[PDB]
Amino acid sequence: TYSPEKIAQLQVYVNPIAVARDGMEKRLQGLIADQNWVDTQTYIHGPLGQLRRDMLGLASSLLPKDQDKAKTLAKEVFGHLERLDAAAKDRNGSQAKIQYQEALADFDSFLNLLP
Amino acid sequence: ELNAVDAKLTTDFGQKIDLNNSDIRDFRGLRGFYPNLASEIIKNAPYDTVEEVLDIPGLSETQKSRLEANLGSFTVTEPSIELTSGDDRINPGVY
Amino acid sequence: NLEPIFQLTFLGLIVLAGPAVVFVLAFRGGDL
Amino acid sequence: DKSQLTYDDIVNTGLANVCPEISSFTRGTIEVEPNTKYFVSDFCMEPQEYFVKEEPVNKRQKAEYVKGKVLTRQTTSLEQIRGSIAVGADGTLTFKEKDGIDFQPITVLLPGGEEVPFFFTVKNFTGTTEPGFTSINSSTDFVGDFNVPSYRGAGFLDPKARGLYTGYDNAVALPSAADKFRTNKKETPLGKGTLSLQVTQVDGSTGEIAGIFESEQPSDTDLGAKEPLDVKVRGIFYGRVDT
Amino acid sequence: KLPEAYQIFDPLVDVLPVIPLFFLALAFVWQAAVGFK
Amino acid sequence: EIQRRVDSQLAEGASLSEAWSTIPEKLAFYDYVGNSPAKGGLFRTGAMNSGDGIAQEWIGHPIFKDKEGRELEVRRMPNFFETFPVIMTDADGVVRADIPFRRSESKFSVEQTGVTVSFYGGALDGQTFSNPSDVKKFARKAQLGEGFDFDTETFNSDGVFRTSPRGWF
Amino acid sequence: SIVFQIALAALVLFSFVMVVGVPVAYASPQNWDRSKPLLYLGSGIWAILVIVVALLNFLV
Amino acid sequence: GGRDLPSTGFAWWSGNARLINLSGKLLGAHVAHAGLIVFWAGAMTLFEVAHFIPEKPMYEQGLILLPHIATLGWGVGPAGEVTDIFPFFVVGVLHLISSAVLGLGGIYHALRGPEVLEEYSSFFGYDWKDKNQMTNIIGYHLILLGCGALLLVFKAMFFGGVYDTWAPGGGDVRVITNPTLNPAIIFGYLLKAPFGGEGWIISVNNMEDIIGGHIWIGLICISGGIWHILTKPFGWARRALIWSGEAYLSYSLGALSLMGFIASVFVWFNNTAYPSEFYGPTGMEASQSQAFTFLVRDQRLGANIASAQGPTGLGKYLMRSPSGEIIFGGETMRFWDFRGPWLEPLRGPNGLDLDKLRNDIQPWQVRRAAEYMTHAPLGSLNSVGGVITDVNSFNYVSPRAWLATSHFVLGFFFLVGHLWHAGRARAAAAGFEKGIDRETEPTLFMPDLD
Amino acid sequence: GIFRFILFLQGFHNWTLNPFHMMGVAGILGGALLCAIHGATVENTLFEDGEDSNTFRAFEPTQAEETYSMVTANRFWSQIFGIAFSNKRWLHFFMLFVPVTGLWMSSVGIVGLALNLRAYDFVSQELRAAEDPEFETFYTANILLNEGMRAWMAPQDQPHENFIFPEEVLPRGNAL
Amino acid sequence: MESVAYILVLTMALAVLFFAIAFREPPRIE
Ligand code: CLA
Ligand code: CLA
Ligand code: CLA
Ligand code: CLA
Ligand code: CLA
Ligand code: CLA
Ligand SMILES: CC1=C(/C=C/C(C)=C/C=C/C(C)=C/C=C/C=C(C)/C=C/C=C(C)/C=C/C2=C(C)CCCC2(C)C)C(C)(C)CCC1
Ligand SMILES: CC1=C(/C=C/C(C)=C/C=C/C(C)=C/C=C/C=C(C)/C=C/C=C(C)/C=C/C2=C(C)CCCC2(C)C)C(C)(C)CCC1
Ligand SMILES: CCCCCCCCCCCCO[C@@H]1O[C@H](CO)[C@@H](O[C@H]2O[C@H](CO)[C@@H](O)[C@H](O)[C@H]2O)[C@H](O)[C@H]1O
Ligand SMILES: [Ca+2]
Ligand SMILES: [Ca+2]
């Protein structure tokens, strides 16, 4: 399965993924609940600004039989992130709440795939 | 008549590092100072005497040993606003 | 290095190709 | 109000130079304990009127302030300022500016064509009330002093490349008359200004405060070339008190 | 870099883009061959 | 020539003030850059007295010494230069003092190197100046050669050099 | 992989042959009846060589 | 057709004017030339692929064609990193081979085909004075141009997406799903001022607006194509314009000059259609990057970056725009309209936000700002990077600089060509392009001016 | 090397400020203008003396008549510009006169620069700027530019002088 | 008062331009 060494080599990507996940739980949910769409867009552009690279590097450096599922799931978080961006630009509370929940569910499904 | 920084250059400011007026670039000559310990010196300025650079809150033991090692390179003159206003101690327009 | 030898040879072939077309058309009296 | 507006909504419209307004006309108050510090979050300061005390040839004539027109544009507001309001034992409230965009250079034009630049600022303003306050309300007047640094820094070079810590100390274009000008010696003394912040609007639900200010401060001396003029600035202010 | 099975023709590709310039030259040659009539 | 004459008087046994006092004021006046005809301007009109002024007296010869007692000479202004930096070198051509433009990283300011100046002969004979304002002013005077006191109010002299009748011819 | 290099070298050699031949044949009104099927066959051979280069690229 | 001066009246140095009334040889000229354009496209792409180091940024490497392909979403991933080299190679090979086909066809029509197409077919044969046929050709070519714009739309919406530098999570290839069909936004871009802060159409800052514009262009060009097939020029157009081949050439020359100027400004200012991951930073981008880099560096040393006045009295790092927005200080005050994906997270409603500058700056923003300030589009003609006073060790001129300079110059010379061909078309239609007739000289019949 | 000499005369002599040079610039740019405008005017008022669109073969060197219309050219420039040449001989003498006079005037200025007799300064603006540090013109800015170029260029340009200028004495603005 | 002299020489040049255009010697074919 996963050589402990291989696991140690994946940390490079896991630390920013855990940081982005914890921040998405804490700051982003409150900012969406606050109807603060300017700070919502600047959150999903700045502190999440390397989510795509870090998750695709996590999926590339993963076990070779779990790569597709990984990347697939990662791409779904991004799609929810773009739809969240569009709903925040439209000042839509319910649509942005829904896209945040879908992004959270796909992030957690991505986080269940770690060795 | 001299301006004020020329008259400061007549003093011990013109010979060694002044904890109340020297820019951060002058701390590069002491090993281990730039950027962190020099920033803590500049932030906690002014000082009445050299010795109370050891009484900055939040100094680690290695920082205290480094400050004790380079105590003779320091002077204290009166803080002149011509070198301190507008954070010229951090960026005096010199690159 | 042999890379620049080939570059010059390919370039010399391409350079002679156009004047070759002109020269065969002029030598045989084609529709110049 | 520019609270729900985005950058694209405000850009190039002049609304970035105006302070936020307490929409709620609520004449509420903010309760304060007798030995506690309350933080001020986004203190804003919008100058509206500008006056310069004229200097006559006469000595004993009344001085009087004359209105000036701003030549710089909508670049005359202080904003994003953090501060502290501490309540002493005797209910004396003390406003204390900490940091932010707490200065703007402003050039005003007087009748006669004299252009008066000045360093409009609230830098290190400490301002006390009368004692005996249990809240912040419409009677809170923070009157105090602030520092006015020199308009030109010590790194400024004049048109003949003379300055304080850089530049020549003499008039190099006139080699036999180089040291006969007092403008060769530049200086940047620290001036003082007086500021009164009178609160007129308190929204106790969110801790917002608004009101008016009157300020008096010296003008630009151009590195000590000329004597400073007295500038009076009146305007409006807003802040958010952290309960 | 080119894909590996094409890498034998890296020098030829390196002289490929300046061939249009020769075309501008070539017309002059042809006019020289006809006498610039 | 002035140095040859002073050195001859020093070799005879005179003191520095005694040797420098035997230099004629006319000879020291020739050793001044404002009498060089390559310092004028096309539209700086009239007499050279309309420039620096009417010369009144030779101030004497400055000797600049650093805190360590190295004699320093101010590098003289060449004919090409409208302005010139103030540089002071020792006997073996090492810059020991200057007047810095940027005083953030200065290492050889008159104030930092403790430069004093003593005058021999002339109006300031036997005097020693230690204030860096006066020392820098005498350094700028030494840039122009021998120093002279000038009356500027008679012809309302503007302070820029004129060329002589030699240059105009 | 050497047969793909042989195919591409054949393509560039026949391309040079066509660069020499096509404007000469088009500017020869007195040899046109000989040279027109030669031009047809050259176009077909060049197209077949390009298709073969593509197929052997996906075979290598 | 005459191939000499005695039989045409045109010298060798004006030889291609011998084709004006020879439609078959004109078509072969046009088609061989297209060969040349597609040849340069393919051969330059293969050159750029052969010289490409894919782990190195494209803009470091003198590439102007691979950025165009990468912006379409081929061979790249997040942050514009090169996944595969094969799409760029494919685009090159297909152009190169097709260019061979186009070159063979131009040679045919030019050397062997019929010199005039009018005696052969009425559909293809044209007279320049036949206003119906000229507008028919406009119409066919407009339907094709609209189809090309719709092909860009199809690539962005249905076949893999385009690179969006503004994408959340970082810039990435994304599929456009909600294009801006709102004609108020699409045509208000046309109504915006060509000045600072407005930027006309150069300021299009999102891929949804770009793809929606190409839906409208495709629709507009297809509708205008049918219009011009089915219709003939009206009386005001017939009385206003010159109807000749040189006249239509000069109209196209003025059009090309306008688009060359627009392209140079587009690549100089716009970072959306020309993403900075491929083209490098714009000049405004790099200046704001330097101001941000030293804001971050001095803030790390403990400077109060908001309360710091500079030597002039303005804020050293932060100051106010003329409308009041909180912007970076120094000379980059000029560039306060700049928007970029690395910078916009630190912007609030009023401009640059103090709270975000204090505790929201990420290391990747610092890395991007340092890279962009050191890849400013400043360089020498022999490709020595940086300011011109720097020494020879940095081999870099930005692709934005090369593309902008090229197209400005091209645009200027095509305006010159417009003036030359319009003036000559007017004189030739009026009958005095060959000089003043001595007998009927018009000035000799005019009254004196004074 | 010629470029160095050019920049040298800028920073050491303020040779742009010299009216003798300014007359030379007027003469050279005017001669280039006269060349361009005369060639274009002749080529666009040509008489139709041939059948080709190639108008160059409608001229014979032994012909007695003018190949272009002086009258039409004069009317064109009189209505476009306000004035025009009416005399061909004066036109060609002026075409001689302008750049030759420009060269002679700039030579007079160079003879002035040989003795450092420069148009370096406007003494009134220097005295005003020395007494008033708000007064700035483009002339004073150019004076500062010359000062900087002299100090930074002299040690490498005059290596025989052994100018040792330490880094602290070099004039420079903020941050550069 | 040097501004008066500058205004005078510039005005003289512009007036010469007016008189040289509006009251030129008229070109006549003879
Ligand atoms: C070779 C001739 C010569 C020389 C070398 C001198 C030299 C001198 N004279 Mg004497 N002078 C002369 C002739 C000469 N003079 C003549 C002929 C007269 C009678 C008018 C005088 C009257 C005179 C007076 C009244 C005074 C002098 C003074 C002086 C001194 C200052 C000179 C000065 O300021 O000039 C300044 C020179 C210039 C600013 C140059 C002006 C040249 C103009 C600008 C050139 C014009 C160019 C032209 C228009 C372009 C043509 C256009 C194109 C189409 C061809 C100097 C020692 C002064 C002095 O100090 O007295 C003791 C003084 O007061 N002189
Ligand atoms: C884009 C460039 C371009 C193109 C497409 C053309 C095209 C044309 N020109 Mg123009 N021309 C050009 C540039 C161009 N010209 C320039 C730059 C000049 C100035 C020197 C001229 C000067 C000029 C004159 C003076 C004349 C023409 C004429 C012609 C036409 C007939 C040519 C002819 O009889 O050639 C015959 C020439 C040959 C048979 C020599 C061989 C030419 C072939 C094409 C070589 C192709 C080589 C290529 C590598 C082979 C690839 C083959 C395959 C693999 C694709 C033709 C349509 C003539 C015209 O108006 O006709 C009425 C004419 O009189 N041209
Ligand atoms: C839009 C046109 C365009 C642009 C922007 C570029 C830009 C670039 N190319 Mg490319 N290239 C082009 C066309 C273009 N090229 C064409 C047509 C060819 C075929 C000849 C090439 C062949 C080519 C090669 C083979 C290489 C490049 C390289 C480069 C890079 C460095 C360029 C350099 O050092 O130039 C140096 C600058 C010059 C030579 C200046 C030329 C000045 C011209 C002649 C002025 C013309 C003015 C005007 C039009 C003339 C009209 C006269 C009349 C009207 C009076 C740069 C990214 C290099 C690179 O790094 O690639 C990886 C490289 O190796 N290019
Ligand atoms: C703009 C380009 C263009 C135009 C207008 C013409 C026009 C013409 N050609 Mg030419 N031709 C061209 C390009 C062009 N050709 C090219 C590139 C080649 C090389 C392959 C040829 C080779 C060629 C030959 C060998 C002959 C002609 C002939 C003719 C004439 C009869 C056409 C015919 O039978 O159509 C009717 C045919 C069709 C409707 C079927 C073809 C439909 C096309 C080819 C399919 C789709 C086009 C394309 C693949 C789409 C993508 C193109 C891409 C650039 C976007 C006509 C004047 C003939 C001639 O001279 O008559 C005397 C003739 O013998 N052509
Ligand atoms: C590139 C393709 C193309 C070309 C060559 C033409 C060519 C022509 N069109 Mg067609 N047209 C096109 C595309 C094209 N059209 C499209 C896509 C559509 C659909 C929207 C139409 C719809 C259309 C109609 C409805 C009509 C024409 C007409 C005409 C004819 C006269 C046009 C004229 O005088 O304009 C000159 C322009 C003017 C006189 C208008 C002056 C307004 C000022 C000058 C605009 C200045 C804008 C400035 C320069 C640039 C700013 C850019 C932007 C911000 C606006 C001419 C044959 C006319 C005709 O005869 O019908 C058969 C006509 O009535 N066209
Ligand atoms: C697509 C655009 C286009 C088209 C189709 C034409 C078509 C035509 N032009 Mg026009 N022209 C154009 C653009 C265009 N022009 C532009 C942009 C300009 C401004 C510069 C001109 C200026 C112009 C003039 C001044 C004249 C024409 C003429 C002509 C006719 C004869 C051209 C000929 O035989 O050239 C022959 C080609 C040459 C002699 C070679 C040109 C050499 C150039 C300078 C090379 C430039 C360098 C290039 C960038 C690459 C650098 C290579 C370097 C490394 C060596 C023909 C109808 C003539 C005319 O009026 O006929 C009626 C004429 O006198 N053209
Ligand atoms: C008419 C005329 C003219 C013109 C001509 C022209 C313009 C042309 C053209 C032409 C063309 C336009 C062409 C072409 C071509 C192409 C080719 C021939 C190709 C190809 C291919 C190949 C072979 C490729 C290969 C490869 C691959 C596949 C991949 C890898 C790499 C390589 C490269 C190897 C002139 C001016 C002379 C004048 C006279 C007349
Ligand atoms: C795609 C896109 C888009 C869109 C765009 C659009 C929608 C457009 C358009 C366009 C248009 C819509 C245009 C136009 C134009 C026009 C012109 C350019 C014109 C003109 C003119 C002329 C040419 C005229 C002339 C004349 C006159 C003046 C009078 C007399 C007669 C004559 C004819 C001479 C956007 C931006 C959104 C985004 C990006 C992408
Ligand atoms: C038909 C118009 C053509 C242009 C002609 C106009 C100019 C002619 C002269 C009249 C000008 C009088 O106008 C007046 O000038 C003075 C002198 O600069 C200006 O005064 C200005 O400069 C002086 C000194 O330089 C300052 O002390 C004053 O504070 C300042 O405003 C006045 O602000 C202006 O109102
Ligand atoms: Ca190679
Ligand atoms: Ca220092």
User: Token pair 């307490």 is at which residue?
Assistant: D22
- Residue H339, burial from CB neighbour count under 10 angstroms (0-12, 13-18, 19+): middle
Answer whether B95 touches F (CB < 8 Å): no
- Tokens at residue H21, please? 């009334």
CA dist., res. H280 & res. H274, Å (int)? 9
One DSSP character per residue, chain C reads -HHHHHHHHHHHHHHHHHHHHHHHHHHTT---
I71 vs J17, J24, J29: nearest CB? J29
The alpha carbons of chain F give a radius of gyration, in whole angstroms, of 17
Is any atom of ligand 4 closer than 6 Å to the C-beta of H117? Answer: yes
Chains B and F touch (3+ CB pairs under 8 A): yes
| H206, H350, H356: best to mutate for the D interface, most D CBs within 10 A | H350
One DSSP character per residue, chain D reads --SS--HHHHTTTTGGGS-----S--B--EE--TT-EEEEEEEEEEEEEEEEE---S-SSS---EEE-EE-S-S---EEEEEEEEEE-TTS-EEEEEEEEE-EEEEEEE-TTS-EEEEEEE-TT-EEE--S--SEE-TT-EEEEEEEE--SS-TT---TTSB-SSBBBSS-TTSGGGTT--GGGS-----EEEEEEEEEEEEETTTTEEEEEEEEEEE---TTTTSPPPEEEEEEEEEEEEE-
HEC profile of chain F: CHHHHHHHHHHHCCCHHHHHHCCCHHHHHHCEHHHCHHHCECCCCCCHHHCCCEEEEECCEEEEECCCCCEEEECCCCCCCCCCCCEEECCCCCEEEECCCECCCCCCEHHHHCCEEEEECCCCCCCEECCHHHHHHHHHHHHCECCEEEECCCCCCCCCCCCCHHHHC
Q: Which ligand is nearest to the CA of D116?
A: 9
Answer whether I156 touches H (CB < 8 Å): no
Sequence-separated contacts (24+) of A54-57 with Cβ below 8 Å: A54/A13, A54/A16, A54/A17, A54/A20, A55/A13, A55/A17, A55/A110, A56/H77, A56/H78, A57/A12, A57/A13
- Written as one letter, the residue type at H281 is P
Q: Is I83's CB within 8 Å of J20's CB? A: yes
Helix (H, G, I), strand (E, B) or coil at I123: helix
Distance from CA of E37 to the nearest CA of G (A): 18
Q: Is D170's CB within 8 Å of F53's CB? A: no
Q: For I119, which residue in chain F has the nearest alpha carbon?
A: F42
- Tokens at residue H133, please? 């046929």
What is the 8-class DSSP label of residue H60?
G
DSSP-H helix ranges across H320-442: 354-359, 363-373, 399-430
Q: Which ligand is nearest to the CA of B23?
A: 11
- Written as one letter, the residue type at A56 is L
CA dist., res. D83 & res. D97, Å (int)? 4
Q: Which ligand is nearest to the CA of H411?
A: 6
Residues contacting residue C4 through CB under 8 Å, at least 6 positions apart: none
Report the sign of the C-alpha dihedral through residues D22, D26, D27, D31, in that order: negative
Distance from CA of G47 to the nearest CA of H (A): 9
Helix (H, G, I), strand (E, B) or coil at H108: helix
Q: Which of residues 18-37 of B touch H (CB under 8 A)?
A: 24, 35
Is any atom of ligand 6 closer than 6 Å to the C-beta of H416? Answer: yes
Q: Is G12's CB within 8 Å of E12's CB? A: yes
Residue with the smallest CA separation from ligand 1 atom 34 is F45
Backbone angles phi, psi at F59, to 5 degrees: -80, -10
Q: Which residues of H are annotated as a binding site for [CaMn4O5] cluster?
A: 331, 334
Residue F134 lies in a domain: yes
HSE (CB half, 13 Å, CA atoms) of H287? 18
Distance from CA of G43 to the nearest CA of E (A): 21
Containing A64, the helix (H) or strand (E) segment is none
The alpha carbons of chain B give a radius of gyration, in whole angstroms, of 13
Is any atom of ligand 4 closer than 6 Å to the C-beta of H114? Answer: yes
Ligand 1 geometric centre to CA of J1 (Å): 24
Is any atom of ligand 9 closer than 6 Å to the C-beta of D113? Answer: yes
Ligand 4 geometric centre to CA of H128 (Å): 21
Distance from CA of D4 to the nearest CA of I (A): 40
CA dist., res. I136 & res. I147, Å (int)? 16
- Written as one letter, the residue type at F43 is F
Total number of domains constituting chain F: 1
How far apart, in Å, are the Cα atoms of H289 and each of D124, H299, H367, H369?
Answer: 31, 15, 10, 5
With the most atoms of ligand 4 within 8 angstroms of its CB, the residue from H36, H94, H97, H109 to mutate is: H109
Q: Which ligand is nearest to the CA of D113?
A: 9
Helix (H, G, I), strand (E, B) or coil at E26: helix
CA dist., res. I149 & res. A102, Å (int)? 65
Pocket residues for ligand 1 (CB within 6 Å)? F 42-43, 45-47, 165, 168-169; I 101
Please answer whether residues F122 and F58 qualify as being in contact, where contact means their C-beta atoms are separated by less than 8 angstroms.
yes
Ligand 1 geometric centre to CA of F43 (Å): 10
Ligand 7 geometric centre to CA of H14 (Å): 25
Q: Is F45 left (phi over 0), alpha (psi -120 to 50) or beta?
A: beta
Of H428, H429, H6, H433, give the one whose Cα is nearest residue I43: H433
Answer whether H111 touches G (CB < 8 Å): yes
Is any atom of ligand 4 closer than 6 Å to the C-beta of H27? Answer: yes
- Residue F32, burial from CB neighbour count under 10 angstroms (0-12, 13-18, 19+): middle
What is the 8-class DSSP label of residue B1?
-
H350 vs D79, D105, D119: nearest CB? D79
CA dist., res. D134 & res. D90, Å (int)? 9
End-to-end CA gap in chain F? 27
F interface with B, Cβ–Cβ < 8 A, is: 102-106, 109, 111-112, 132-133
Q: Is H348 left (phi over 0), alpha (psi -120 to 50) or beta?
A: beta
CA dist., res. D182 & res. D204, Å (int)? 56
Range of the domain at F43: 1-162
Distance from CA of F118 to the nearest CA of D (A): 20
Helix (H, G, I), strand (E, B) or coil at H10: coil
Of E33, D11, D35, give the one whose Cα is nearest residue H321: D11
CA dist., res. H26 & res. H199, Å (int)? 40
Of A47, A51, A54, give the one whose Cα is nearest residue H365: A47
Q: Is D153's CB within 8 Å of B86's CB? A: yes
Range of the domain at A4: 1-115
CA dist., res. G30 & res. G36, Å (int)? 11
Q: Is G50's CB within 8 Å of H111's CB? A: no
Q: Which of residues 7-26 of J touch H (CB under 8 A)?
A: 24, 26
Total number of domains constituting chain G: 1
The alpha carbons of chain E give a radius of gyration, in whole angstroms, of 16
Backbone angles phi, psi at H294, to 5 degrees: -80, -25
Residue with the smallest CA separation from ligand 6 atom 12 is H417
- Tokens at residue I146, please? 């010359």
Ligand 5 geometric centre to CA of H258 (Å): 15
What is the DSSP pairing of strand B74-75 with strand B17-18? Answer: parallel
What is the DSSP pairing of strand D103-109 with strand D69-70? Answer: antiparallel
**Interface partners of B (3+ CB pairs, < 8 Å)?**
D, F, H, I
Ligand 8 geometric centre to CA of H258 (Å): 10
Helix (H, G, I), strand (E, B) or coil at B95: coil
CA dist., res. B52 & res. H324, Å (int)? 44
Q: Is J28's CB within 8 Å of H448's CB? A: yes
| Residues across chain I | 176
What is the 8-class DSSP label of residue A18?
H
Helix (H, G, I), strand (E, B) or coil at H327: strand
Of H36, H23, H51, H42, give the one whose Cα is nearest residue H110: H23
End-to-end CA gap in chain H? 51
Q: Which residues of H are annotated as a binding site?
A: 331, 334
Residues contacting residue F112 through CB under 8 Å, at least 6 positions apart: B9, B14, B15, F106
Please state the atom number of ligand 5 nearest to the C-alpha of residue H191: 54
CA dist., res. E14 & res. C8, Å (int)? 10
CA dist., res. A48 & res. H168, Å (int)? 7
Report the sign of the C-alpha dihedral through residues J21, J22, J24, J25, in that order: positive
I92 is in an annotated binding site: yes
DSSP-H helix ranges across chain I: 2-13, 19-44, 70-80, 88-114, 123-131, 138-157
Rounded to 10 deg, the angle between the H131-157 and H207-230 helix axes is 150
User: Token pair 């160079």 is at which residue?
Assistant: I110
CA dist., res. D182 & res. B2, Å (int)? 11
One DSSP character per residue, B29-85 reads GSTTTTTHHHHHHHHT---SSGGGGTT-TT--HHHHHHHHHTGGGEE--PPPHHHHT
Of D238, D241, D233, give the one whose Cα is nearest residue D51: D233
Helix (H, G, I), strand (E, B) or coil at H274: coil
CA dist., res. D212 & res. D210, Å (int)? 7
Residue with the smallest CA separation from ligand 6 atom 57 is H17
Ligand 7 geometric centre to CA of H263 (Å): 28
CA dist., res. D127 & res. D43, Å (int)? 14
**Interface partners of F (3+ CB pairs, < 8 Å)?**
B, D, I
Of I24, I22, I19, I38, give the one whose Cα is nearest residue I94: I38
Residues contacting residue D151 through CB under 8 Å, at least 6 positions apart: D105, D117, D118, D119, D219, D220, D221, D222, H313
- Tokens at residue A33, please? 């609940």
Residue with the smallest CA separation from ligand 3 atom 28 is H62
Residues contacting residue H314 through CB under 8 Å, at least 6 positions apart: D105, H329
Beta bridge mates, F98: F87, F109
**Interface partners of D (3+ CB pairs, < 8 Å)?**
A, B, F, H, I
Of H411, H403, H408, H406, give the one whose Cα is nearest residue H63: H403
Report the sign of the C-alpha dihedral through residues H343, H346, H347, H353, in that order: negative
For residue B35, whether the previous peptide bond is cis, meaning omega lies within 30 degrees of 0, is: yes
Rounded to 10 deg, the angle between the C2-27 and G2-26 helix axes is 30
Please answer whether residues H361 and H296 qualify as being in contact, where contact means their C-beta atoms are separated by less than 8 angstroms.
yes
Q: For I75, which residue in chain J has the nearest alpha carbon?
A: J27
